[PDB]
Each structure stands twice: as C-alpha cells, then as structure tokens.
C-alpha cells in the first residue's frame, strides 16, 4: 500500500507520525574546488576604441575581484544539546593547503585534467576540481599579440564571450565578500549541478548514498558549506565541505505535543502538563537519535534529512513515552504549569487542539463550513475532512498530506494529579522528578 | 601565552580560551550614499528599430526601478540582555535629509567632486558619496544633443555600456524591495570595496581603527546596515550606518561549559550542575563586557568582533567563576538538573566531553584511529593529537588552531552535594542561591 501514518494519544495530548525514512548527516567530506587565474599586467594597450573601452572595463571588474578576494585572506529541549565547530573539517583541509607545495600539487594534478583525487601532506585523500579556466581564456584569447595588442578590438561577440566567463568569478567573490569567506547553503555558482552530481559520484561513499544525494541534490546544497580558502600562484581555491549521509533509510517518527489541562470552571485553579520531548526520532544502531528542535530537519517526501550534531542519543526505550508514559524503564519528560492557554499544534496528518477556558475552538472545512466545535480539553482531528482548525482568533490551515490517523482513546493523565500538591512551576522536569516532589509534600504533612 | 591558549577546569566542567583581542562595536557612524538620477519623460525616439528596441527596454527597466523606490517611501543567559533600536541613528539622519534644503545642500556639495563632509542642520557632520552618476550618463551620451536626442541608434556597444551602468541601480532597488528598505550586511552593490575603503579612511575615527576596519573589511560589512532613505530633486540617497569600533585590542576569553554529573549506576538518581555563564568576555574599562550568545560575535585570527549591545557589563571579579567558583566576592551562575545526558562542547583548542550512563565516548585521530575511551564524567581532550571526538552517535570534528591547553585537575563540585536535598530544578539560579535552599532544607531536618 501507501506510505506514512499517524496516531494521537488522548492521554498525553500528543501524536506521533511514523513511516518516515531517515537521512542523517554523520560526517563531512571535504573536497577542493579550484579556478585558474590569469595574473595579468595592467599595461595591456592603453587604447580608446568603442569596445576596447568595454573590455578594459571588464578587466577591471576581474582584476579587482582577484584583489577583493586576496584582501579576504588575512591572518523546548534544544538547550541540552552541546555544541561543535561546524566547519572545522573543511578549514583544517583549507589550513593544510597553505603548506608549501600542497597547492602546486593540485595545480599539477590538474593541468592535464579537470578532476583528480590527491593526497595532502597529512594523508587525507581529497577530491579536486578545476571549474573555470580564466588563465587560459585571458592569456590565449584576449591578448591578441598578432592582431593587434588589445588596442583596437574587432568583434563584439568577444566582449560578451568574456563577460560571460568572468561573470561566474564576479558572482563568487561577491558571495564571499558578503559572507566572510564562508557560505551555506552552497549556491549554483560555487558548484553547478553538473559539477555537484559529478562530485557526488566520485566521492568515497556507497551507492545507497549516491542515489539519496543525487535525487535530493537541492538538500545537499543546504547541508554544505563553501569555505573560501586560498589564492596564491595562479589558483583560486575554495573548499566545499559536503555532507556524508552515513545512516539512511532507518525508521523515523515525529512527536507532536500540546499542553493538557484540567478543565475546571474557576478562572484559576487549573493544572497543566505538557510533553516536552517534541521532535524527530530516527532509529540509529540500537539507539534513537532525537532531534529536539524539529525545524532544523528538512524533509523531502518521507526522507527526513537531519544533522546528527543537533541530536541527543537515547535508549531505544524512549519510544515508551508514547505508548505508556508512566512505564518503569524510561522516565518521560514534561513541564508543569497553571497557565491553561488555548492553542493548536498541527500534526503530519491532522491537528491537535488544546481548547481551554472561554476560548472558542472549531474545525472548519472548504465546503461544509464549520463541522466541529471542540469542548474544553485536549482533542484531535484528522485532516481527512477538515481543512482548517481555528482556536481563538488564529486560523490554522491543516496539512493536506495523505495517510491514516488513529485516535487512541485514553484518560488524560492530568486527571491523576491531586491539584493541591501538584508542582505548578517545573520548567523541564520529568514524570518521576515530579512524582518525588509529591512523595515529599505528603511527608511534609507531619501533623500534631 | 605567546598567542592563543586554553585551560580546562575539571572541577566545573568548563574551559576558557584566552589570547584573543577585542574589537567591539560601541557606536554608529552614519554616512550618506547618493546616486544621481535623470528624471526623463518616456519618448526616446519611440520608433521600432533593432537596437532602439533594446535601449527602450533598459530605459524602461530604469524608470521602473526609480518609481519602485519612490513607492517604497509612502502614505543560555541572553535573556538578561536588554534591547535597543539598531538603526535609530541612521534613521534619524535619514529623517533630517527630508528637511528643506538639506538635499540640495548635498547636491550642491557634490557637483565639483564625489566625496565631501557636510554639516546637516542639526550640526551632525556627515560623510557623503556619489557612487553612480546616471544623470550625467543619460543626459550627455544617451540623449545626444546635437543630432538628435538619439532617434535610431548606431552602435550596440552603447546598449551594453548602458545596461552595465544601469545594473547597479537595479541590483540596489532589488535588495531594498526585498528587505523593506533596510539591508544588512552591506553588499558589494550598496558599497563597493573601493568605496568602503575610502569611507573608512575619511571617517572621523582613529588610525587604530582605520587599520582594523581596512583589513577586516568583510566583517565591517556584516556590522553595518544600509538604509534606503530619500529620493527627491534628482537625487537618490541611502544612509550607510557603519560601525564605530570604540574598544579595540583589549583581551578576550571564551567560556565554554558543559553539564557536570554524578556517575551513579542507577538509571535515575544522578544530579547535574552546569555553568551558565558561558559566552565571550572582553574587558573594556575595569569591567568585563560579557557576550552571552557567542554568535553575535564573529572571529578573525585572535580578533573577536562583538557588538556591545548584545552585552552585559559585569565587574572584573567575574573571572573568579573560572578560578574558584565558590569565592565570596562574585556569585557564579549555574543551572541544576537531574538530566544526565551525554554530549560534547567543542572548544577553541580542545573538546569537552560529558559522557554519562551507558553512552559510548571515544576520541579518534585521523591516522592512529581511536586513542581514548572516556569514563563516565566530565573530561577534556587537547586538540594536539586528536581530530575527531564521538559522543553517542554524534561525530565532532575538533578545531585545528595551534595553542597550549592546560588541564586543571580538581574534584568536580557536584561530588560535594548531598543529593537527597539538592535542588534538581533551578533553570538559572546561582551558587549561593542553591546553597541557600540547601542550608535551609538541611535545617528543617530537625528533631524533638
């Protein structure tokens, strides 16, 4: 049959969407892109002809862009996450490129041909690429030294042919001059598709990846960096740090949460409880990589491209908070409050609606109009027959992807708490971390 | 030390990296950029010839960009920080150009030459710049005035010469139309390097700065805004609000922190503690400017470009949290938890590894493979012999800067706390503040 599915748990005001397929970035592959430069002398014939003034205008554009580039090289729960340097890998290769001949090694590997693999001084085997040959175009087609010195140019089609080639370089040095020598996502200027697919294919990766990457090439651009590196001899060199999708096609699910309160009629005197583990969950070698800020993940179809360094790694048993939030093994996380406030949280196949107090909560559709008015509490609505959900004054258009949703009838857990001794302010604490503060407040009841 | 250095404190599971050199943005200098406009009536000899069809397109393209601009003007711990208006100065200047003769005063100041200072009506002395002279191109050389305003064009090179001159205005109004009249960083279109280097050099700043700014021109771009301002008489004017680097070259350090836990074997029953005072620190006048989100800041070599308005200013005695977290003078900030979850925090010269529970923590090198397997608790690893570090499923590439790291041995402080009375939930509280809640609960543990 078809693909992705979802279920709502009435008991904990949450839903998970399963049936997705991972695409985790685990490692970084560095590759070196080079552009060959003419290092000309600005005394090419000092003439004033109609189109010689246009070429000389274009050399300027170029000669400045080389120096502009030279001057550039000068010497809930996401808080649990821990931090890294992102492009250390790339820069480290870029830093190795500054040793003595490492650059010429690349010049030489690449004069016979356009692609090459090369071993740097520290052994790392790195893919290199010559994508523009401005040295050859300028030195053997714009210094006409038979006819006649670049003082008097003949055709216009040679003015254009040039500002076409040079255009790429101007758009490159522009992107760097803005972004302090490091760009993401990687534009079509740093790497054209023809180049990026070629590069995908010559990488030290498996076919499982080479397919993933090539079909979702527009994502590969977003998870890559382009680090402007060095420009000495007649070479411009920037490093492109592509991602290594080391785990692929494992199951992924996406956990939705909204707050769950008592529905008492008093203006105050309501208790709230909200599952805090919102986010993505991929299976990753007998443990689950959990991606708490679930926006960073970009999905395409069912494929969930995440970046592992935005993850915790958790026991497989985290998955139990969805089925039995009270179970013994894992200790599911929540956050308490007295702030009974209405909202909806839209799921992959539906919507969750947290409707409280005097707030007005409906579910409308394109044709039948309003087709449900929610009663106070945490409820759910499939995207089958509903297009919008409105809570208060905010309209939510619901997601119109295809798939089966299952309503898991259950007693909301916020009912099991005695509100007189329920810890109203606890901003990331757990199930068990709350059950202790209750075992306590009952002991703190020492009578006469 | 002789350049850059780091020390890891085993006792507070944190590290500071010192030897960096400040460059703070303290103030804003406003400067006026103009482009001169011809304000034509749409009859270029409005006939149907080959190259006349192209010019009329570019005149059209231009006349729109001017109207388009016209229509634009119409009828942890970052939470302590405090908030301001960014472009109040630039906007306030912009508002002053709308007073009566202020524009003609600039116009008049700029027909003899392309730069001049001018005193606006309120005494503020402003640097001005005419960077494109389209009035002059169009009035002399595109409507030739002997024969006959150009009726049916001769050469093609005048079309190109034109859409070259004209690109700049288009690519400028493109940027503004998208970013609603305020862009940052200041692109190569708003101000070319040749210009931004000029403007630095003529600013009312010191040589200490003219040098800093001139070398790190790509960081000055990121710390400037560009405000589209006015378009009256035949003048286009935008204010480029460049930064003023008012403390420069003072020492900076960077405090890295990670969570520090008990390593008991039980699945729950561990206490954690984390230094929250993480982020950059430059000292600037007997006080330490503290930058809690370490990305307001950009680095270049040792130079740490920060923006003082993403800063607290704290007494010098703040550095004691690094030396002796319990001292009386200053009251170091922490955050408690029961959530012992494994992670790394990569530093400037090393890696911190917070490894707990059943989590698998190694440190590899590029060639020898794995060279350390961490035991549960908070440890550190120099970047000397280490290239990657893995915690759970997440791979970290470590920074490859050269510098000396010092591992400062100590009993981790979380070993000193009696966990049956330790506040597991405190989302930003202090050292002394926790020791309060304990000194108390330990008192309520009294007899009869």
């Amino acid at each position, epitope marked *: 049959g078809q693909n992705i599915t979802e279920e709502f748990y009435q008991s904990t005001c949450s839903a998970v969407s399963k049936g997705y*397929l991972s695409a985790l970035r*685990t*490692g*970084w*592959y*560095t590759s070196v892109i080079t552009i060959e430069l003419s290092n000309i002398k600005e005394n090419k014939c000092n003439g004033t002809d109609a189109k010689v003034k246009l070429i000389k205008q274009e050399l300027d554009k170029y000669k400045n862009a080389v120096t502009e580039l030279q001057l550039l090289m000068q010497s809930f729960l996401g808080f649990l996450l821990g931090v890294g340097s992102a492009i250390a*890998s790339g820069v480290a290769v870029c830093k190795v490129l500054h040793l003595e001949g490492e650059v010429n090694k690349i010049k030489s590997a690449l004069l016979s041909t356009n692609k090459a*693999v090369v*071993s740097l001084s520290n*052994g*790392v*085997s*790195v*893919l290199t690429f010559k994508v523009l040959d401005l040295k050859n175009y300028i030195d053997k087609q714009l210094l006409p030294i038979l006819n006649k010195q670049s003082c008097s140019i003949s055709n216009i089609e040679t003015v254009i042919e040039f500002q076409q080639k040079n255009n790429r370089l101007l758009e490159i040095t522009r992107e760097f001059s803005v972004n302090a020598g490091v760009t993401t996502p990687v534009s079509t200027y740093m790497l054209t598709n023809s180049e990026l697919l070629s590069l995908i*294919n*010559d*990488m*030290p*990766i*498996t*076919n*499982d*990846q080479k*397919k*993933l990457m090539s079909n979702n090439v527009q994502i590969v651009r977003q998870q890559s960096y382009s680090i402007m590196c060095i420009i000495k001899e007649e070479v411009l060199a920037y490093v492109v740090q592509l991602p*290594l*999708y*080391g*785990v*692929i*096609d*494992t*199951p992924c699910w996406k956990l939705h949460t909204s707050p769950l309160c008592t529905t008492n009629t008093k203006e105050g005197s309501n208790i709230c409880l909200t599952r805090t583990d919102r986010g993505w969950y991929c*299976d*990753n*070698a*007998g443990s689950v990589s959990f991606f708490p800020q679930a926006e960073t993940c970009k999905v395409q179809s069912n494929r969930v491209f995440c970046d592992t360094m935005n993850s915790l790694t958790l026991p*497989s048993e985290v998955n139990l908070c969805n089925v039995d939030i009270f179970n013994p093994k894992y200790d599911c996380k929540i956050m308490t409050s007295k702030t009974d406030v209405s909202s909806s949280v839209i799921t992959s196949l539906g919507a969750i609606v947290s409707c409280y107090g005097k707030t007005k909560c409906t579910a409308s559709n394109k044709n039948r109009g309003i087709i449900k008015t929610f009663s106070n509490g945490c409820d759910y609505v499939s995207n089958k027959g509903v297009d919008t959900v409105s809570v208060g004054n905010t309209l939510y258009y619901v997601n119109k992807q295809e798939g089966k949703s299952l309503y898991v009838k259950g007693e909301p857990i916020i009912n099991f708490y005695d509100p007189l001794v329920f810890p109203s302010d606890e901003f990331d604490a757990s199930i068990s971390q709350v059950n202790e503060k209750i075992n306590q407040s009952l002991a703190f009841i020492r009578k006469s | 030390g002789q350049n850059i250095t780091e020390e890891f404190y085993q006792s507070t599971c944190s590290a500071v990296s010192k030897g960096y050199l400040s460059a703070l943005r303290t103030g804003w200098y406003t400067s006026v950029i103009t482009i001169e406009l011809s304000n034509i009536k749409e009859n270029k000899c409005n006939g149907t010839d080959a190259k006349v069809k192209l010019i009329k397109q570019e005149l059209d393209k231009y006349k729109n960009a001017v109207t388009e601009l016209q229509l634009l003007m119409q009828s942890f711990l970052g939470f302590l920080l405090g908030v301001g208006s960014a472009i109040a100065s630039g906007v306030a200047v912009c508002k002053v150009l709308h007073l009566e003769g202020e524009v003609n005063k600039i116009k008049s100041a700029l027909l003899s030459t392309n730069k001049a200072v001018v005193s606006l009506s309120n005494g503020v002395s402003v640097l001005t710049f005419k960077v494109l002279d389209l009035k002059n191109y169009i009035d002399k050389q595109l409507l030739p005035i002997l024969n006959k305003q150009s009726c049916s064009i001769s050469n093609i090179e005048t079309v190109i010469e034109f859409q070259q001159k004209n690109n700049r205005l288009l690519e400028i109004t493109r940027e503004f139309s998208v970013n609603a009249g305020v862009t940052t960083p200041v692109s190569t279109y708003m101000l070319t390097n040749s210009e931004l280097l000029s403007l630095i050099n003529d600013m009312p700043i010191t040589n200490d700065q003219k040098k800093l700014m001139s070398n790190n021109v790509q960081i000055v771009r990121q710390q400037s805004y560009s405000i589209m301002c006015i378009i009256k008489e035949e003048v286009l004017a935008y204010v480029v609000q460049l930064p003023l680097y008012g403390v420069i070259d003072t020492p900076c350090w960077k405090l890295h922190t990670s969570p520090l836990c008990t390593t008991n074997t039980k699945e729950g029953s561990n206490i954690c503690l984390t230094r929250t005072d993480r982020g950059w620190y430059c000292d600037n006048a007997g006080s330490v400017s503290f930058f809690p989100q370490a990305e307001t800041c950009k680095v270049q070599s040792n130079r740490v470009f920060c923006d003082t308005m993403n800063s607290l200013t704290l007494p010098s005695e703040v550095n004691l949290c690094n030396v002796d977290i319990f001292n009386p003078k200053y009251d170091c900030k922490i955050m408690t938890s029961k959530t012992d979850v494994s992670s790394s925090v990569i530093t400037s010269l090393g890696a911190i590894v917070s490894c707990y529970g059943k989590t698998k923590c190694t440190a*590899s090198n*590029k*060639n*020898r*493979g*794995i060279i350390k397997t961490f035991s549960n608790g908070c440890d550190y690893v120099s970047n000397k012999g280490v*290239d*990657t570090v893995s915690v759970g499923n997440t*791979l970290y590439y470590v920074n490859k800067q050269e510098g000396k790291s010092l591992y400062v041995k100590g009993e981790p402080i979380i070993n000193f706390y009696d966990p049956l009375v330790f506040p597991s939930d405190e989302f930003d509280a202090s050292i002394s503040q926790v020791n309060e809640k304990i000194n108390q609960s330990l008192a309520f543990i009294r007899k009869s």
Partner: single-chain antibody
C-alpha cells in the same frame, strides 16, 4: 547473543531455483543494512547483494544481476535471497551479514556480524600476498594493494580472520581499530592505494585465512584474495 542463522541451502540442478533466508536475533533488525556475501569452494570472498535498512536502496554484484533477488521482512526479523537460473559458478557458502559504517572523511561499509553460512552447490579486484609464515613469538605482516578506485579514491580498509572451517570474524575496521574481542597484538595501516595487517607474536589461534576488505566505486565493495598465515615450530 547477537546472532544470524541462515537456511534453505542444499543442492540444486542448473537453470533452477532456491531461496535462502537469514534470520537475525538479539538486535533491532530494521536499523542496519543487510548483505549476502559468498565464498567459493576453496578461496575468495565475494560480495553478492546489499539491501538498505528499509529496502529502498538495493544493489547487486555483476555476477548475479537479473538472476538473484534480495528482500527483507523486518517484521519477521529476516533477510531473503531469491536465486533463479543458477549456474555452476554460484556454488559457495552463502553468508548473511550485518553492515556498519563509521565516517571520518568517508563512508565505506564493513561487516561486524556474520552467520555460519548455508552451503549451496549447483551441479548435475584487490590483491594481497597469498601466503605468510612465521614462528611463534615473531612479527609478520600482510600487504593489501588496491587501485585508483576503492582505496586510492579515498575509501577505507577492513580486515577479517577466518579460521579454517569457520565464518569470517571482523578483525580490523576503519584502518586501525580493534573490535571487542581482538587482542592488541593485531594492528593495521592504510597508505595511498594500499594497506597492511601486522600480527605481533604468533599463536595457535592465529593460523587462519586473512582477508582485507574495502569498497570500490563500481564493484561496490571488494575483498582481498586472501592470505593464509601459518605458524611453525
């Protein structure tokens, strides 16, 4: 026990069929990519077919294209191989294997878990030094030499120890890292287009066939020709 146990092997007449099944147990199957790698009657180890974790990415060696069909039932914790139109070259021990990848500047699978294999008879490259011998206590080394593609194009190297009757066991992964049960005696290298295994102090248990493994961009995963290390006295 993390374990794989194959089944369905026997004898088959050419132009025939037979459907091998590997059942896995003691780990969550759905998370790893599963493989068939087979071994000829007397020597080499050659990769057959690979299947991704959720069955979206599946690939076959040229040897078996259009004839063999790989498949998996994650719900039944099992992996299948559907062989049709068999030939006399297909006779071999068919191993079932768990694949794994650990990425520093490359992602080249290795096999950390093997079954015992089921034998299937049908009737009616990267070179390494073919033999090494040395005395107990001594040091010996095995050279493993590859090409412009695979190792020289930036992939990694792995090593296996196959005692005479047994299944391959993982000996070295990612050039120089030892698994749980491998003594510090064993140590290995990578260089350019080639590798080297180094055994310090020969034992009774060290007498076995040694295969280096790596991944080639077209051949899609490749073993050495094998090295019989023999211990004297």
């Amino acid at each position: 026990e993390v374990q794989l146990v194959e089944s369905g092997g026997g004898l088959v007449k050419p132009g025939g069929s037979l459907r091998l099944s590997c059942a896995a147990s003691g780990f969550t199957f759905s998370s790893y990519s599963m493989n068939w790698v087979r071994q000829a009657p007397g020597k080499g180890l050659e990769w057959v077919s690979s299947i991704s974790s959720s069955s979206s990415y599946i690939y076959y060696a040229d040897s078996v294209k259009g004839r063999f069909t790989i498949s998996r039932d994650n719900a039944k914790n099992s992996l299948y191989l559907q062989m049709n139109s068999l030939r006399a070259e297909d006779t071999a021990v068919y191993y079932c294997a768990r694949a794994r990848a650990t990425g520093y500047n490359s992602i080249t699978p290795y096999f950390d878990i093997w079954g015992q294999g089921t034998l299937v008879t049908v009737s009616s490259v990267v070179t390494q030094t073919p033999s090494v011998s040395g005395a107990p206590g001594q040091r010996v080394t095995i050279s493993c030499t590859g090409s412009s593609s695979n190792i020289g194009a930036g992939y990694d190297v792995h090593w296996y120890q196959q005692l005479p009757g047994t299944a391959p066991k993982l000996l070295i992964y990612d050039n120089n890292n030892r698994p749980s049960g491998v003594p510090d005696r064993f140590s290995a290298s990578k260089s350019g287009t080639s590798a080297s295994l180094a055994i310090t102090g020969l034992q009774a248990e060290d007498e076995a066939d040694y295969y280096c493994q790596s991944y080639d961009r077209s051949l899609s995963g490749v073993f050495g020709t094998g090295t019989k290390v023999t211990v004297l006295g």
